[model samples]
Target: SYKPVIVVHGLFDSSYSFRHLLEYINETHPGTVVTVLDLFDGRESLRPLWEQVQGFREAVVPIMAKAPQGVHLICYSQGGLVCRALLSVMDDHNVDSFISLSSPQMGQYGDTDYLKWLFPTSMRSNLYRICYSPWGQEFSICNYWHDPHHDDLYLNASSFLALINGERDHPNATVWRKNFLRVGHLVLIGGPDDGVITPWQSSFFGFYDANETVLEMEEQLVYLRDSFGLKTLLARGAIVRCPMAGISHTAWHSNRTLYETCIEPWLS
Candidate 1:
């Protein structure tokens, strides 16, 4: 039997926006079980990441239990981070394929329109001031906000990304890593014109340094230290990154070309 596929939505997005994904899968592989979860949507997605995590877990537990052969998890945008947290924290998750679609896997550090709309006054350079604060952590966007310049504040203060990446020391690092390693495949899909993920390379576990220069996945500290099983996933050849051009962040999950090229094979 094909594994059940569970879809997780992203920031400012909902399952309604992902109907194309469901249609594509149904058209290509009929009878394949696919569930696009609708939890935090639109304005409510701005809530704390942990809160969403709890809500998602509540919705997914029954689905997870029904599939003895494991399931495939497809998460897009901020939902990818939620899935990452979901996988890391759940030691019993039977997930065979983890498809992260245009998510800020490493972190986000750019002047995307989302930033402009929210802050209006602040730019990417100084977002750390708010992101690293206690109040900032209340919002999902600031939870994983990465400021390359403010290394200390980010490393010490980021509640979501820092802890999940194992960059910040926590008691759960060892177990969480084992939990993350439970998945068999880690497919990361994104592109240069994503327009939201700052450098866009973040989707592939790449990011910018203080100088605004981009770094590849291998050069990241998390990969080097094998933090959270990123290097382990790479070493096992379980990681697949599709860095395409001519694609925007919003277009990734809905683009038929991307679905066939980067997502189809993994579904089965």
Candidate 2:
């Protein structure tokens, strides 16, 4: 029997996003189990992403220890960001495959000023709170201060953007390359219709580029399959450049047409 496909949602979103996918999966693939990790219920911010990453790590380590099987992860938006972080810390053997839907791997803000345009009120309030929120001296401080600040109700829009850029350019990038590249199976899924995260930024983190080795989506996937002795790594995985057809970042999961064309094939 195959291990279940764990479904995770992005920031400010609950498992409610996966309701359609869950019902579809159950109705079509009866024996397959679907699980969701509720990262937040609107109480926290940046910390929730990290906490969920740790939670996923905690949950999976034991399952791997007990069973000689692999698990598939279906993560979207901010949830995919955590999944990317998890790849840095955890061993490669724990995951069989990965399917990212509109995940802002670089950061929720991506490479634009659109976040303010989308959620002006919430961005201001939360950023103010993150500023006063206490953190240990060991942690990095004021990383996002360098990024361009868009004056609005939201506080850390700049900070959030900077943090993700830092993660990709600094130590986190090295860590990501070491672990995720060594895994047997990997895939990056995204497209042009992503309103939240532009296609350029979504595919930037995990693949190599023209001038620099800026991570290309397929390179990351190929790295996993070739480096590790993971069975079915290539056969079971892909770096899908989906055609979301006017789908926004939030709508990726709910878009039945996109799912049918991009995701349905993977399940079979």
Q: Pick the candidate with the highest TM-score.
A: 1
- Tens digits of per-residue lDDT for model 1, 1-268: 4789999988787889988999999899899899988889889999998888889998898998999888999999999999999999999988998999999988888887778899998988988888889999998999999898998999888889999998999999999999999998999999988888877889988889789889998998899998899889988999988878978888888889999999998987
Give a tens-digit lDDT track for model 2, residues 1-268: 5566777676556777689888767766677766777655343323544565677787666655654666677787666766665765675545656777766554332334444543355452244334323341111111221211332322333333233333223445444445664443455566666665633345334422323334553444333433221223335543445545577666777766766776666663
> Which whole-number lDDT from 0 to 100 does residue 109 have in model 1?
89
TM-score of each model, paired residue for residue: 0.98, 0.64
Number of clashes in every candidate structure? 0, 8
Scanning candidate 1 in windows of ten residues, the lowest lDDT window is 106-115
Off by over 4 Å in 2: 63-67, 108-176, 182-184, 199-238
